[PDB]
Amino acid sequence: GPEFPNDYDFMEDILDETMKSTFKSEYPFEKRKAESERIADRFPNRIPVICEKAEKSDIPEIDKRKYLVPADLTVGQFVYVIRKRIMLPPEKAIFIFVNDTLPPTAALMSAIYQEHKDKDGFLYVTYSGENTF
Ligand SMILES: CNC[C@H](O)c1ccc(O)c(O)c1
């Protein structure tokens, strides 16, 4: 029994480039920057991470794509949380990319933030499975 949003049919069999849509392209830069600035004030010791599903990847979608990551949390630990959230069976694979790269699983998310944070203050991560449509 899928949990939200995976009780919805996304109709991937006709999803087009005219329909692709992500956090950056759905919300104005200025609104995004103001939100991460608010988080720096209100949750100072959290790293704000936008985590979204790679395009056409064969893996469940995620409800909350916005994470308040503890500063000393490793990449390995963050991957485990996403796995948990999409209820991915342990026998199926999951990878996260930063700048189209697999970060080293022992790396602190704080370090990845300092190296790769967006002009808008967020860290953008992409997750995917082994296959894609
Ligand atoms: C699609 N029909 C309802 C939906 O499947 C649904 C309802 C309650 C839930 O807790 C749930 O995970 C999914």
Residue numbers in the entry: 1 to 133
Reported in the publication:
Landmark proteins called autophagy receptors bind specific targets and interact with Atg8-family proteins on the isolation membrane through the Atg8-family-interacting motif (AIM) (also called the LC3-interacting region, LIR). The core of the AIM is composed of four amino-acid residues [W/F/Y]-X-X-[L/I/V]28. The first aromatic residue and the fourth aliphatic residue bind to two hydrophobic pockets in Atg8 (the W- and L-sites, respectively), and the main chain of the motif forms an intermolecular parallel β-sheet with a β-strand (β2) of Atg828. Nonetheless, deletion of the short helix from RTN3245–264 reduced the interactions with mAtg8s. Thus, the C-terminal helix-assisted AIM/LIR is a unique structural basis commonly seen in the interactions of yeast Atg40 and these mammalian ER-phagy receptors with Atg8-family proteins.
To elucidate the structural basis of the Atg40–Atg8 interaction, we determined the crystal structure of Atg8 N-terminally fused with the C-terminal sequence of Atg40 (Atg40237–252) containing the AIM (Y242-D-F-M). As with canonical AIMs, the first and fourth residues Y242 and M245 bound to the W- and L-sites of Atg8, respectively. In addition, the second residue D243 formed salt bridges with the R67 residue of Atg8. Moreover, the Atg40 region C-terminal to M245 assumed a helical conformation, and D247 in this helix formed salt bridges with R67 of Atg8. Residue F238 on the N-terminal side of the core motif also interacted with I21 and the aliphatic portion of R20 of Atg8. We prepared two “wild-type” peptides, Atg40234–252 and Atg40237–252, because the former peptide with the M245A and D243A D247A mutations could not be synthesized. Both Atg40234–252 and Atg40237–252 bound Atg8 with similar Kd values (0.59 ± 0.32 μM and 0.57 ± 0.51 μM, respectively). Importantly, ER-phagy was defective in cells expressing the D243A, D247A, and F238A mutants of Atg40, demonstrating that enhancement of Atg40 binding to Atg8 by these additional interactions is required for ER-phagy. Our structural analysis revealed that residue M245 bound properly to the L-site on Atg8; thus Atg40 is the first example of a protein in its class that uses methionine at the fourth position of the AIM. However, in Atg40, the main chain at M245 was included in the C-terminal helix, and thus distant from Atg8, enabling accommodation of methionine’s long side chain in the L-site.
